[PDB]
Amino acid sequence: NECISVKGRIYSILKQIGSGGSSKVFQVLNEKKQIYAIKYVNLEEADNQTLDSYRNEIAYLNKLQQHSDKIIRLYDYEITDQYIYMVMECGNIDLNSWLKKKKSIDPWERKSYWKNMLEAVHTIHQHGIVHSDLKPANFLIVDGMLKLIDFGIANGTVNYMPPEAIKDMISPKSDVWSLGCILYYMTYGKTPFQQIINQISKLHAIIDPNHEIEFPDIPEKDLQDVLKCCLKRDPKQRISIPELLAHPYVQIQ
Amino acid sequence: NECISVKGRIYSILKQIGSGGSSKVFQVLNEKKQIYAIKYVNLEEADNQTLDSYRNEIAYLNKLQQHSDKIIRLYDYEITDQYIYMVMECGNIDLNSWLKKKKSIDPWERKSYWKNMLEAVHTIHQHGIVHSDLKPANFLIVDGMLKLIDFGIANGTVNYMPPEAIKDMISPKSDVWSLGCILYYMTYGKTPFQQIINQISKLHAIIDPNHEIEFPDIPEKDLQDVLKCCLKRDPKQRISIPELLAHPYVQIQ
Numbered sequence: 143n144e145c146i147s148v149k150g151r152i153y154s155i156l157k158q159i160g161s162g163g164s165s166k167v168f169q170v171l172n173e174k175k176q177i178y179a180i181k182y183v184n185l186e187e188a189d190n191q192t193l194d195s196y197r198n199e200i201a202y203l204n205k206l207q208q209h210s211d212k213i214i215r216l217y218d219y220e221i222t223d224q225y226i227y228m229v230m231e232c233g234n235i236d237l238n239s240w241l242k243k244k245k246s247i248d249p250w251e252r253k254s255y256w257k258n259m260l261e262a263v264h265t266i267h268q269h270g271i272v273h274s275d276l277k278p279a280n281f282l283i284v285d286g287m288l289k290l291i292d293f294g295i296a297n298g299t300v301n302y303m304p305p306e307a308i309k310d311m312i313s314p315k316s317d318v319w320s321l322g323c324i325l326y327y328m329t330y331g332k333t334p335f336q337q338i339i340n341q342i343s344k345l346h347a348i349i350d351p352n353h354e355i356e357f358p359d360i361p362e363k364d365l366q367d368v369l370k371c372c373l374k375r376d377p378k379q380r381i382s383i384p385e386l387l388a389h390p391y392v393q394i395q
Numbered sequence: 396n397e398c399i400s401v402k403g404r405i406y407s408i409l410k411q412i413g414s415g416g417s418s419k420v421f422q423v424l425n426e427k428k429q430i431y432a433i434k435y436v437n438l439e440e441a442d443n444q445t446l447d448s449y450r451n452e453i454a455y456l457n458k459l460q461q462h463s464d465k466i467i468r469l470y471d472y473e474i475t476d477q478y479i480y481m482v483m484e485c486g487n488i489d490l491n492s493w494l495k496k497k498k499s500i501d502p503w504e505r506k507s508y509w510k511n512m513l514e515a516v517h518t519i520h521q522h523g524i525v526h527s528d529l530k531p532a533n534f535l536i537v538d539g540m541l542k543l544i545d546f547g548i549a550n551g552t553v554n555y556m557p558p559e560a561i562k563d564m565i566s567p568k569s570d571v572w573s574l575g576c577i578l579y580y581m582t583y584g585k586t587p588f589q590q591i592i593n594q595i596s597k598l599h600a601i602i603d604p605n606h607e608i609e610f611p612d613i614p615e616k617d618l619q620d621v622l623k624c625c626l627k628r629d630p631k632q633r634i635s636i637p638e639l640l641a642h643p644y645v646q647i648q
């Protein structure tokens with residue numbers, strides 16, 4: 143049974159949750175026996191470039207705290223030349239797991255989730271920030287409310303990748319794609335391109351105009367519409383977040 | 396226990412070997428109780444486009460028979476609107492398996508293999524044909540001699556993929572890359588980019604000039620050279636097959 147000093151105050155590890163290479167996340171117990179999460183990041187091989195990226199991300203998250211409830215809380219942090227410790231709220235589970243483990247989505251519970259994600263992405267969008275790497279993992283479930291976990295600034299599938307990031311061999315429109323895949327999965331039970339096995343076959347698909355993303359008729363046609371509008375390959379055509387906030391799917395019934 | 400009619404002559408399945416979706420390969424027993432392989436291809440969903448590709452490939456293989464011993468033998472074929480049956484030699488195993496199962500390569504057994512592959516690729520190269528999708532699978536081991544299995548004309552990793560096929564969002568030089576990865580694996584025990592986990596991280600690597608493919612010093616410096624020359628990102632720089640046939644690694648000691 144071991145501990146961590148963050149800004150001179152102490153927490154006892156209870157168990158490790160996340161691993162991400164040069165980083166670990168622990169559920170911990172603070173002084174007043176309350177429970178928290180600590181993200182830990184090793185800066186041994188950190189080169190100034192890599193380094194500032196982290197500095198930037200901290201600054202922003204820390205800053206964007208009092209802008210949206212749908213971003214994870216950051217309670218305190220320590221930062222030195224070798225490491226960062228961040229003290230964030232501890233949640234129940236992340237969206238991706240809940241997905242893996244879950245095999246039924248109350249159509250109503252799906253809607254709220256989407257609602258949360260949009261608020262979040264919007265916020266970071268209203269600040270020059272574009273995440274560009276969104277996957278169910280980047281969200282956290284905390285009493286049926288989702289939070290965004292990171293801003294995609296610092297530092298394994300191609301699935302949620304948009305056509306345009308591929309034609310790249312940067313737009314807010316790129317986050318809509320992803321966002322919609324995450325909806326798509328939630329809806330047709332899986333991502334739009336899981337079918338395709340061959341990892342290069344999937345790259346071509348993601349970019350070829352003549353491939354039809356399949357859109358199975360379903361009760362909710364709002365929802366059907368949305369996904370159709372989020373997955374429009376041309377970005378200039380793709381719906382925008384301000385539009386998506388004002389679509390029926392979120393607005394009416 | 397079941398059979399197959401190919402050009403009116405009959406073979407009894409003994410066991411299924413390959414599966415490839417709309418295709419199966421069987422080890423079979425002919426009349427005179429000799430053993431063969433039959434590739435079977437279903438043409439139900441075949442569209443004229445897809446269709447001719449198959450027609451083309453058959454024609455070529457069939458044709459390129461009496462040009463090189465290092466291409467699989469094709470004994471006879473039947474072709475109709477619904478299917479193809481091809482009767483080819485049956486081998487002992489394919490290179491990829493022998494690789495998976497094998498964990499030691501007589502440096503000498505490696506050399507012969509390379510030698511075989513080159514002869515083969517060269518042949519198909521001397522006919523406008525560029526395979527463009529080479530992986531240990533496309534070869535077959537038949538009494539320690541390798542054969543090429545198909546020509547990459549008809550019809551799941553990114554590993555053996557060359558920079559240039561990626562910047563594509565067609566040159567003989569593209570087959571050298573692949574060919575060299577297959578050598579690389581054989582040599583440093585794995586492909587040049589397996590390290591990289593993230594499937595998009597690997598795409599960037601495969602194309603970024605500043606990433607060093609790592610080249611561990613070893614006894615054979617010929618071999619070391621070769622791989623260094625095969626994996627040159629700029630195609631115009633990359634060595635050519637006629638050069639590779641005339642390199643020490645194949646020529647001297």
Ligand SMILES: CCc1cccc(CC)c1NC(=O)c1nn(C)c2c1CCc1cnc(Nc3ccc(C(=O)NC4CCN(C)CC4)cc3OC(F)(F)F)nc1-2
Pocket residue numbers: 159160161162163165166167169179181214230231232233234235236239279280281282291292
């Ligand atoms: C190095 C980490 C990292 C790097 C880059 C980017 C990101 C996120 C975008 C992150 N990743 C992170 O920064 C990160 N990863 N996790 C998991 C958390 C964070 C931040 C805060 C945070 C707050 N609360 C939690 N709660 C929990 C989330 C998931 C589980 C869990 O059950 N995991 C299981 C793992 C095995 N599978 C099969 C089933 C689920 C348990 C949890 O704590 C609880 F115990 F209290 F519930 N997690 C986190």
Ligand SMILES: CCc1cccc(CC)c1NC(=O)c1nn(C)c2c1CCc1cnc(Nc3ccc(C(=O)NC4CCN(C)CC4)cc3OC(F)(F)F)nc1-2
Pocket residue numbers: 412413414415416418419420422432434467483484485486487488489492532533534535544545
């Ligand atoms: C649909 C097929 C297809 C489509 C596109 C492209 C291509 C090749 C480029 C092909 N694929 C093919 O066209 C194709 N695939 N195989 C396997 C053969 C061919 C063509 C002729 C051919 C002739 N002889 C063999 N021999 C054998 C090759 C491998 C095994 C074997 O042991 N497989 C195991 C599978 C499980 N793993 C774990 C261990 C190895 C057994 C074999 O026959 C023997 F029994 F007599 F030894 N194979 C083939």
